[PDB]
Amino acid sequence: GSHSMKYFYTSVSRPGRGEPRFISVGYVDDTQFVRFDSDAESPREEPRAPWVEQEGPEYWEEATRRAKEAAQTHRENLRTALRYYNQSEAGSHTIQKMYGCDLGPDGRLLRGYHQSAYDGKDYIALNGDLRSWTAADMAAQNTQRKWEGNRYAERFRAYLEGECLEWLRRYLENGKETLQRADPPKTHVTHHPVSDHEATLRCWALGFYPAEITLTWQRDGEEQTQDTEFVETRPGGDGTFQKWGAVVVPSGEEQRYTCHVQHEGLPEPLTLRWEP
Amino acid sequence: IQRTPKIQVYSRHPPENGKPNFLNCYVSGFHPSDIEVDLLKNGEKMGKVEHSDLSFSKDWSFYLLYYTEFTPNEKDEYACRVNHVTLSGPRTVKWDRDM
Amino acid sequence: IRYPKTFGW
Numbered sequence: 077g078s079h080s081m082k083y084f085y086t087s088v089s090r091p092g093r094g095e096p097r098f099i100s101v102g103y104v105d106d107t108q109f110v111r112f113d114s115d116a117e118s119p120r121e122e123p124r125a126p127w128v129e130q131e132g133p134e135y136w137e138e139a140t141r142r143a144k145e146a147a148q149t150h151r152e153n154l155r156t157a158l159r160y161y162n163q164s165e166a167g168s169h170t171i172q173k174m175y176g177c178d179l180g181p182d183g184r185l186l187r188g189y190h191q192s193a194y195d196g197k198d199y200i201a202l203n204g205d206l207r208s209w210t211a212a213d214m215a216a217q218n219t220q221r222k223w224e225g226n227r228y229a230e231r232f233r234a235y236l237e238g239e240c241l242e243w244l245r246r247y248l249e250n251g252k253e254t255l256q257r258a259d260p261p262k263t264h265v266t267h268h269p270v271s272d273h274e275a276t277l278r279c280w281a282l283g284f285y286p287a288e289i290t291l292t293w294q295r296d297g298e299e300q301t302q303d304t305e306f307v308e309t310r311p312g313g314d315g316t317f318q319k320w321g322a323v324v325v326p327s328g329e330e331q332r333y334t335c336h337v338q339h340e341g342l343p344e345p346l347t348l349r350w351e352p
Numbered sequence: 353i354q355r356t357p358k359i360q361v362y363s364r365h366p367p368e369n370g371k372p373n374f375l376n377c378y379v380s381g382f383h384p385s386d387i388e389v390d391l392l393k394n395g396e397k398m399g400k401v402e403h404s405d406l407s408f409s410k411d412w413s414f415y416l417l418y419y420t421e422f423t424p425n426e427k428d429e430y431a432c433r434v435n436h437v438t439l440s441g442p443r444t445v446k447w448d449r450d451m
Numbered sequence: 452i453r454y455p456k457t458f459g460w
Contacts, residue, residue, distance in 0.1 A: 084407050084408060086406055086407075086414075088385055099406045108405065111405045170385065172408055195353065196384070278451075282366070308358065308360070310362065310376070311404075311417050313419045314374075
């Protein structure tokens with residue numbers, strides 16, 4: 077039911093401290109499976125998921141090769157950027173690049189991604205049509221023009237519909253019981269008095285996958301945004317995710333508030349009340 | 353552009369005094385990637401603290417997960433200390449079992 | 452699997 081594979085690239089220049097640091101990670105949906113760090117004691121593509129370890133040496137050698145090539149080219153892009161924005165070589169700068177493909181249920185390509193930022197701001201991104209590019213500024217227009225000149229969008233499109241999908245399906249089959257799972261969130265409501273006239277209601281959602289989830293509070297059956305605090309979805313450290321949503325309530329109205337939780341692993345959405 | 357990091361110090365499982373558990377400090381939405389994170393028990397750096405591989409989200413902001421094994425009680429205090437260029441000195445967030 | 456070619460800016 078719609079899956080995704082994405083690669084994340086981060087190159088940071090560090091003047092005086094040698095070559096720029098290169099860190100790239102691979103994800104299937106919300107599960108990391110590979111990792112390459114130029115500052116590792118023996119830089120190479122490493123497995124971070126149990127279901128990818130079964131790949132033979134050829135896979136790790138090829139992956140290491142591609143990762144290293146990406147590192148070199150990124151290092152060249154740093155310099156090219158210094159020249160574009162007319163910046164000093166004594167300052168630190170960062171290039172980030174995410175790309176990947178979305179496997180639709182019909183087995184065909186659903187979505188394509190190839191976007192990159194410089195110093196935390198959009199630089200250049202592949203458009204939804206997977207044929208044209210969008211440049212964020214003047215400097216990126218050079219990259220856009222020269223990428224159009226050598227038909228890169230098409231070349232990346234060949235990968236999107238080729239190796240990307242094939243290997244995505246492969247990963248999906250090999251890690252079926254962990255990637256194609258829908259673990260529902262363990263939920264409960266807690267009560268934390270703020271004073272004598274108020275109290276915080278906290279709705280918990282623990283150990284669910286994937287990270288996609290929805291938590292809302294309602295007063296008398298009507299959604300409430302006032303006096304609510306929803307924290308950013310956080311990882312469990314074991315491959316799961318957590319999230320809680322709190323609401324400040326007048327003492328005595330606790331039973332008029334309900335928590336609503338929507339998740340893929342839930343047969344039907346949950347309506348929770350504080351059970352002392 | 354620079355962004356201030358968000359910190360969430362929490363446990364993997366609902367904490368029970370005397371029961372082994374996992375302490376997590378989740379730092380997100382920061383930039384650049386240069387950052388220092390420490391897990392502290394009673395103000396002192398814990399023994400074995402590790403972190404996840406650097407990654408980022410849609411808005412390009414980075415996020416990291418630092419973690420260690422801890423067994424919570426009533427007398428001990430756990431916290432997470434973060435240092436970043438956007439922070440005026442180190443910021444320390446105590447672990448609250450209610451959060 | 453990673454993308455073989457890397458585009459220069």
